[PDB]
From Swiss-Prot:
<comment type="similarity">
    <text>Belongs to the TDRD1 family.</text>
</comment>
<comment type="function">
    <text>Plays a central role during spermatogenesis by participating in the repression transposable elements and preventing their mobilization, which is essential for the germline integrity. Acts via the piRNA metabolic process, which mediates the repression of transposable elements during meiosis by forming complexes composed of piRNAs and Piwi proteins and governs the methylation and subsequent repression of transposons. Required for the localization of Piwi proteins to the meiotic nuage.</text>
</comment>
<comment type="subunit">
    <text>Found in a mRNP complex, at least composed of TDRD1, TDRD6, TDRD7 and DDX4. Interacts with MAEL. Interacts with PIWIL1, PIWIL2 and PIWIL4 (when methylated on arginine residues). Interacts with TDRD12.</text>
</comment>
<feature type="domain" description="Tudor 3">
    <location>
        <begin position="58"/>
        <end position="117"/>
    </location>
</feature>
<protein>
    <recommendedName>
        <fullName>Tudor domain-containing protein 1</fullName>
    </recommendedName>
</protein>
């Protein structure tokens, strides 16, 4: 089995929506390119059909699979993260960035044609900022949430790695462009990486 993350070129501007959110150094974005959100929804419908069959699984680290999310009762794409002392396994939901605990009956084998679409839960962080103390305050997390929730921001991909990208987010909902990182620095909630 083979799979991929969404790819970028340096300084690529592209629209995003933040789905998951833990800190300014850790959040997950859906990137609006190549009809990603349209294709992801179609994929999840296909997976509901396939995973509604007579149980077609050898759970091993880094193996792709169909995991069942109890939080809404549907099957989504996943990667095995850890195997616990119990018969339970920790998985990462690759299209959304969250990690959960599930029983072995809540896992399935994934067919190759459901891997053709890149995984869409892109790990992200704001570039050129740091924690003022040494860990992120929750007041910094809270305004970052405030400024991004249910909003379609412009992202500029400033640094690429194998395991996530560093971005600069801009809210263009008014003629005054609100660059998030500058807002967190100007409001003394984080320090610049000068």
């Amino acid at each position: 089995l083979e799979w991929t993350w969404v790819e970028f070129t340096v300084d690529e501007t592209v629209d995003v929506v933040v789905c998951m959110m833990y800190s300014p150094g850790e959040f997950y974005c859906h990137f609006l390119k190549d009809d990603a959100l349209e294709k992801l929804d179609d994929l999840n419908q296909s997976l509901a059909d396939y995973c509604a069959q007579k149980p077609p699984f050898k759970a091993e680290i880094g193996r792709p699979c169909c995991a069942f999310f109890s939080g809404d009762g549907n099957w989504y794409r996943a990667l095995v993260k850890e195997i616990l002392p119990s018969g339970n396994v920790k998985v990462h939901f690759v299209d959304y960035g969250n990690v959960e605990e599930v029983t072995t009956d809540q896992l399935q084998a994934i067919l190759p044609q459901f891997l053709l679409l890149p995984f869409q839960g892109m790990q992200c962080w704001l570039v050129d900022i740091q924690p003022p103390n040494k860990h992120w305050t929750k007041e910094a997390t809270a305004r970052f949430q405030a400024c991004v929730v249910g909003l379609k921001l412009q992202a500029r991909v400033v640094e690429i790695t194998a395991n996530g990208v560093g971005v600069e987010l801009t809210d263009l909902s008014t003629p005054y462009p609100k660059i998030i990182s500058d807002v967190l620095i100007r409001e003394q909630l984080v320090l610049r990486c000068g």
